Curated annotation (Swiss-Prot), chain A:
Annotated protein name in UniProt: Capsid fiber protein
Domain of life: Viruses
Compartments, as annotated in UniProt: Virion
Complexes and interactors: Homotrimer. Forms a super helix coiled coil in the homotrimer.
Family: Belongs to the phi29likevirus major capsid fiber protein family.
Phylogenetic lineage: Viruses, Duplodnaviria, Heunggongvirae, Uroviricota, Caudoviricetes
Coiled coil regions in record: none
Function: Protein that forms the 55 capsid fibers. These fibers are not always present and may have been lost in some lab strains. They may enhance the attachment of the virions onto the host cell wall.
Length: 112, 56
């Protein structure tokens, strides 16, 4: 009358749906496919990201939109103004970096 | 003996504590809540990060 009575996964009456899928899975990749629903996060964990995955992960990682544009290597003139302000505190130098200094900036830049 | 055999998670005598929690879990979100202890990493994997999570 046998020795072991090897039950199967579906015999475990209080196992959950994800729990049974995991118990059946053979490899770590298969387990990651069950557990991680966000496709961008799954791509990071698999070490295999497209440019779209990268942009989407950057959206999850950074709040500032001007920083995000810099990280995408695509900045508008407005993004550039804001990024200049993160990099330089002197108002007259910020005028120079804009390419369009005010009259006051010009006087102060010459003095500088 | 009837042969179907209904065995519950706690009948599996060499299952680990996390292993039994995972076997009972019904959804991927539930599984992530068990497996990922770092709250900032869990937030990234869930695609739902606060400014504090982002800084961390």
């Amino acid at each position: 009358r046998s020795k072991e009575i090897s039950i199967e996964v579906e015999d475990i009456k209080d196992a959950g749906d994800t729990g049974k899928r995991l118990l059946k899975i053979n490899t770590p990749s298969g387990a990651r496919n069950i557990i991680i629903e966000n496709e961008d996060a799954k791509a990071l964990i698999n070490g295999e990201t497209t440019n779209t995955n990268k942009k989407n992960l950057q959206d999850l990682l950074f709040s500032d939109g001007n920083v995000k544009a810099f990280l995408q290597a695509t900045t508008t003139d407005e993004n550039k103004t804001a990024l200049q302000q993160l990099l330089v505190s002197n108002a007259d130098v910020l005028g120079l970096l804009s390419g369009n200094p005010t009259s006051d900036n010009k006087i102060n830049l010459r003095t500088m």
